[PDB]
Amino acid sequence: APMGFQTKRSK
Amino acid sequence: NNPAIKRIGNHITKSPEDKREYRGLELANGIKVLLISDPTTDKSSAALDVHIGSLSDPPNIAGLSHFLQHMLFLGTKKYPKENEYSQFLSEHAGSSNAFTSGEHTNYYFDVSHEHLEGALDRFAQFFLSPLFDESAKDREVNAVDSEHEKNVMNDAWRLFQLEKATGNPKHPFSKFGTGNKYTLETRPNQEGIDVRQELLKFHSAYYSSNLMAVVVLGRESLDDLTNLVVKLFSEVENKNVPLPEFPEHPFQEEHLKQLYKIVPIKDIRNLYVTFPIPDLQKYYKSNPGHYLGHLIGHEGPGSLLSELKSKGWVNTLVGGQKEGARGFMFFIINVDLTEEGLLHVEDIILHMFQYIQKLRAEGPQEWVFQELKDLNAVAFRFKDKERPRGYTSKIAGILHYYPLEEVLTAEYLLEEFRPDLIEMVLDKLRPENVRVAIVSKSFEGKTDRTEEWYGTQYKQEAIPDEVIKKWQNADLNGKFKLPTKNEFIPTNFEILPLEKEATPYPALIKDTAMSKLWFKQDDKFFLPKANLNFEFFSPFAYVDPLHSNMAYLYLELLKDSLNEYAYAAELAGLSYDLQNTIYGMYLSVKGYNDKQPILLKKIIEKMATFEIDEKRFEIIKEAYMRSLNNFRAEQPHQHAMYYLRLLMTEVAWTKDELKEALDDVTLPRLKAFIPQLLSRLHIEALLHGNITKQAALGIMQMVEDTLIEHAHTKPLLPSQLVRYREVQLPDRGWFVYQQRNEVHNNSGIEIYYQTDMQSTSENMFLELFAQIISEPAFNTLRTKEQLGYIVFSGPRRANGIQGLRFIIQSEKPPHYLESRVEAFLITMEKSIEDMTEEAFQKHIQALAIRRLDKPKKLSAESAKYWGEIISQQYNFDRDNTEVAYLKTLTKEDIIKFYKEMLAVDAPRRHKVSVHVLAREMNLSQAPALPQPEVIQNMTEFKRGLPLFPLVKPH
Ligand SMILES: [Zn+2]
């Protein structure tokens, strides 16, 4: 497979 | 003319099937804005993307930009109340969230279409006059620390930051993005830093209109939306901030030809090959990285994966371009490893370079480009409609990289063939600039160094020049052929006309002992897509831990064999899902209708005549063994959910019972399980989309014949078609189950207040109460008391029985979280009494709008129908039915519902608590709680309690 980590506020 | 607007238009290129209306503009202050007008939407949305991220974090204060994100929600000078933003959206059927990448900080929300302006006003203040209240500062720092804490034992995160810590040490790429209580509170205080100002300066210096993009979606006309944005975003001042660039690559020659032996948390085996490449974003119209990614990452016949999997070295492969930042990217080839694939890594990488030289030897293939072009063209034309919140959020991010007119099409459509770009990217995939990382438990003890932030145990070696020379001198392997013509590419997009006897809800068009067929021809979206959902019932699927194992293995062996064949179809927009349920099998085929019956027939026919490769049985079994044991390392709150589901369901095999039964799953005993599983079945199916009743009846009937023929399947008997019940809790009773998490250092807890069966009445009393406490639960347990990052509240539905659940992951012990929650419930009660009767009917219409939000894509509608079918309730008009009843509700009705069912004194209180302990173990206070009976045996507990009835259908 071709390709396609960010800290968020809420889960 | 308008002075507040620098430029307008011209015309935003959209799909012909897209009936929304667009307008792009650039404000005078430099904010790039897209306006989406959709008069049909039930929810309006807006989003803003600042082009500053964690890469712009001060070296002395790691994770500042991430921390600043959290603080904007906590009050502005025009809206000083700490939760005015979240409370507003909560009372108006809305939600909000944000994230912080290396180069971006993205904020977004949705809300009821009538209150867009109200929501947007409060939202705009985030960029204008944020408070950064200091009392809010020393609190929200814990939510950030608790966020990092959940990621500290995550192998994905540990590796992610590890790549950062093995490059140029003070390249901004090396920076720790998330930040914790230490970097944000502890160390700055030691260093005499006032955090509130270094927040305010960062907001002053970097939150400039020059680096911002805005997207707003609403029912209003394009011109009404223009006046709206200009009104409240013309105030964002333009500091004219130079956009950060990172020309020099973090991976210099000192960081190349390096080997990394890494110790994981879970028992996994993976090989990470990485190539440093320049920023290819510039070439997006031709997209050379995608071309190579499609070829290297191909899984069809003759592909690289196809052969590494044949030698029993790998099972999965992902390859292609991975974005880094403005100035640098990566090309990666990642595989999972078998046990002896771990011992032949040098050879695996050799095969990789052999495939690369196959590509170089036959050069760039235009027909390939053309295939990738047409597929993206088709994908864009018939693109499913997106929900406003995520839509605005994504566009706001891509408004920085593409012209206003191309923003909708840029990511999708290719225009230029550039063989030179193809070959030069290909020229940087050589062994002399390679980076290799191996992740396995076998390196435990043999490691020397330790990663700073996550504590990753590993070892760094220079790859022996002996090896590089063997990779550089890579012959052409005759077992690597370029992918052939893709034959699953759709050509038929004719949307069939609506039949005369068409139905608004799925109609039962076949009711035999063998199958129950639900069908609806699409009447809203009119795409060439269709969803074919099937549920196969069989007692032999979950009769015992042994069979539940074999059922899994059988389906994962089947999918493995179909992979080469089905991969071509997925690229052509035709995908399938196949997994084992507690009731049998579940098959779902989604995508374009055109080549859809071909794939399905191939699936069922392979399903009923499966021949098992023994050495694929060995590998997959071993992987499944690891997967069950790897459950030990998932987060405490998931464990808490896992235990409750075991406790409250009639029949449920624990994962530890599945491992004991796995050692006896021999190949001959599995091969004997398959015919017996397929011996007698019952197929309940839903066929929804661009197909006729006749085609649907034909599809369903062709599934049955295929089974009656290859597996000699005849129908199951009705008495065998019943589902599992939920444990009925005694009135005024409280039970507590307690376990420990050997990996994670936080505690988890789920509190379940069980109400009675799902009834049209009982449903809405729960979902209204949940609606009211939704915002305050988040506000109290997290924003105020900072128990944990993960604080969840809302209804729980299983086996036809409902109730209220609280989920918290914290550092504090579960018995303390218990009191806080119980204290919060008392807090809510005396807040339901002193809320105005209009403020009550605001919550009602809030819930009403959420329930009455219609789907916007086919698969979203199919999910709602499929939910009623597997629930065996079949209430397709549930929304209009239950929403109508909701409005009847008075404030006192909810009051006595709390008092009788949920209150601490409650005559009918049904409370179960799951306590997952950590690895090593003024405010409002709680009522005195009774002594709970501690569950020490799961089956013994269930054995001594009644079982709820099953909900009667329709
Ligand atoms: Zn966060």
Numbering used by the authors:
A (entry chain D): 1 to 4, 42 to 48
B (entry chain A): 43 to 963, 979 to 1011
According to the publication:
CC chemokine ligands (CCL) comprise 8-14 kDa chemotactic cytokines (chemokines) involved in diverse immune functions. Extensive structural analyses reveal that most chemokines share a common core structure: an N-terminal extension followed by a 310 helical turn, an anti-parallel three-stranded β-sheet, and an α-helix. CC chemokines also readily dimerize, primarily through the formation of an anti-parallel β-sheet at their N-termini. Certain chemokines, e.g. CCL3, CCL4, and CCL5 form polydisperse, high MW reversible polymers in excess of 600 kDa without the assistance of GAG.
Insulin degrading enzyme (IDE) is a M16 zinc-metalloprotease that selectively degrades amyloidogenic peptides such as amyloid β, peptide vital for the progression of Alzheimer’s disease. To understand the molecular basis of CCL4 recognition by IDE, we solved the structure of CCL4 bound human IDE at 3.2Å. In order to avoid cleavage of CCL4, E111Q was introduced to IDE to remove the catalytic base required for the protonation of a catalytic water. The overall fold of the complex shows that, as in previously reported structures of substrate-bound IDE, IDE adopts a closed conformation. We only could model three N terminal residues of CCL4 at the exosite of IDE and 6 residues of CCL4 at the catalytic cleft of IDE. At the exosite, the electron density corresponds to three N-terminal residues of CCL4, which form hydrogen bonds with the E341 carboxyl, and G361 and L359 carbonyl groups of IDE. At the catalytic site, aa 42-47 of CCL4 are clearly visible. We find that Q111 is in close proximity to the scissile bond of a major cleavage site, K45-R46, with the proper geometry for the proteolytic reaction. In comparison with CCL4 NMR structures, our structure of CCL4-bound IDE reveals that, in order to bind the catalytic chamber of IDE, both the N-terminus and the cleavage loop region of CCL4 must undergo a substantial conformational change upon their interaction with IDE. Most noticeably, the α-helical region of residues 42-47 needs to transform into a β-strand to extend a β-sheet into the catalytic cleft of IDE.
